[PDB]
Symmetry: D2
Subunit: 123 residues, 4 copies
């Protein structure tokens, strides 16, 4: 009964939000990612995401990955992590991400990758 | 300087291979990821991948990300990186990945993410 | 805005604790890292750490790195991050770490590095 | 007889060089790190490093960590990895690093960490 499900509306520790739709039988899902300029805030861009959740042993707490294809930049971010629960109740996504910037010369590749985390909860 | 195109067959610094199909107008692509060794032999599994290439400014050396949904484990890997024309003229994908393992308790989350790199050239 | 000083006793989001001593004029410091749980109990090991704080522009919120030389394993961890005065006034260390495991064959190197984060507040 | 030893002069895949001195009985060592501006090259800065190598089971291929306290910036880099050998002969250090930039507001923390690799060989 305690299936952690990616589908729905999520927010995070930096105040970014994401929506993910139905995950099919192969574990594929699409979504949207907002973001989060200045002021507030400032004002919001919306970016597409595509990923897969791992279906091996139809786990209640599966691992997943997804790519955010940023609309306001040449950058790409990948997130990977796991859907947990958590003492009710509360579903939580613990992710790690890599943010790739575009560089012009391959000589600059070494500096093009940031890493960090995101914890997501239901909105 | 012409394009660096993700479509085709690639190999990497650890001897794994990947094939990527056409990238559509939204930057989407599917493919396959063939890995090893674990032997002796018992060699080659084949896992699906799905990703997107960034299209902002229709760059000749775009960034991209993809998720590999492992068939032989509960794990997921995400790659992100950039398609370069190396100094020598050859196309090269410089990537970094995050390999997420499935843990049973959210207390074991801290240890679930490996990181590394992969450099891909055409087969 | 006053200093953010590494010297003192810290705790973190996973319940591990660390003590750091004086930082000398070159930015050097030693300390201790107390971790757990592995139980039941069999609880607390104590491992040495050694690091440096960056002193360029004698910043109030300097960056730093340190290496923890684990006593109970062959592994090494490195932390790096920054000492902030949080919005609430409290000192906080935001860090990222790389946990390197010992492997026997250089063919197993690709899998030897975990990554994550730790947020430290004063005990 | 095949002890991989950190002490000496090393170069890397980006053309940076490092010298490390004697490692004591607790595994501590100091060194220097050059770097590598422009042109060539361009011209070289030299930065101090401090780290430890793990002594548990006096391994022939120990893991280590070290911090580079950059002299020309507010940044800090930590490297961790392992000293291998390799079919002679050839000692090789396979490292992963995190490069922390200084940011002014904790709101900007999420973007302050780059990750990458370095392979080092004897000069
Ligand atoms: N300017 C950019 C950003 N500003 C921001 O809050 N993000 C968020 C924060 C972090 O959740 C995730 C990393 O790519 O995306 C940005 N990504 C990419 N580029
Ligand atoms: N046992 C596993 C592996 N053995 C292997 O070579 N790989 C490769 C190497 C790396 O490209 C990619 C995930 O990092 O998959 C494995 N991934 C996941 N699991
Ligand atoms: N078994 C190990 C551990 N259990 C643990 O809580 N840690 C902590 C968590 C993290 O702060 C730091 C290395 O990542 O050490 C361990 N490190 C290394 N090995
Ligand atoms: N401007 C900077 C650099 N230019 C450079 O080549 N490096 C090198 C490359 C990479 O080996 C290591 C990462 O900090 O240090 C720099 N580090 C830090 N800052
Ligand atoms: C996230 O959604 C919440 C709920 O409506 C909203 O208050 C906030 O504006 C959102 N943040 C962003 C970046 O859109
Ligand atoms: C990768 O491709 C080559 C063909 O060039 C094949 O012979 C090799 O064994 C492949 N490796 C894997 C793991 O499939
Ligand atoms: C950390 O510090 C507290 C004292 O505030 C101590 O009671 C706690 O159990 C410590 N944790 C570890 C792992 O030492
Ligand atoms: C590394 O040392 C070599 C050997 O002398 C030298 O050619 C090169 O100038 C060095 N690179 C840097 C960044 O100092």
């Amino acid at each position: 009964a305690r299936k952690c499900s990616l589908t729905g509306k999520w927010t995070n520790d930096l105040g970014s939000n994401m929506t993910i739709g139905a995950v099919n039988s192969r574990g594929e899902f699409t979504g949207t990612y907002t973001t989060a300029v200045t002021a507030t805030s400032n004002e919001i861009k919306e970016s597409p995401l595509h990923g897969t959740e791992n279906t091996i042993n139809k786990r209640t707490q599966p691992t997943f990955g997804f790519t955010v294809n940023w609309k306001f930049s040449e950058s790409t971010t990948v997130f990977t992590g796991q859907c947990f629960i958590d003492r009710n109740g509360k579903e939580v996504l613990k992710t790690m991400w890599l943010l790739r910037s575009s560089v012009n010369d391959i000589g600059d590749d070494w500096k093009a990758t940031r890493v960090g985390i995101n914890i997501f909860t239901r909105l």
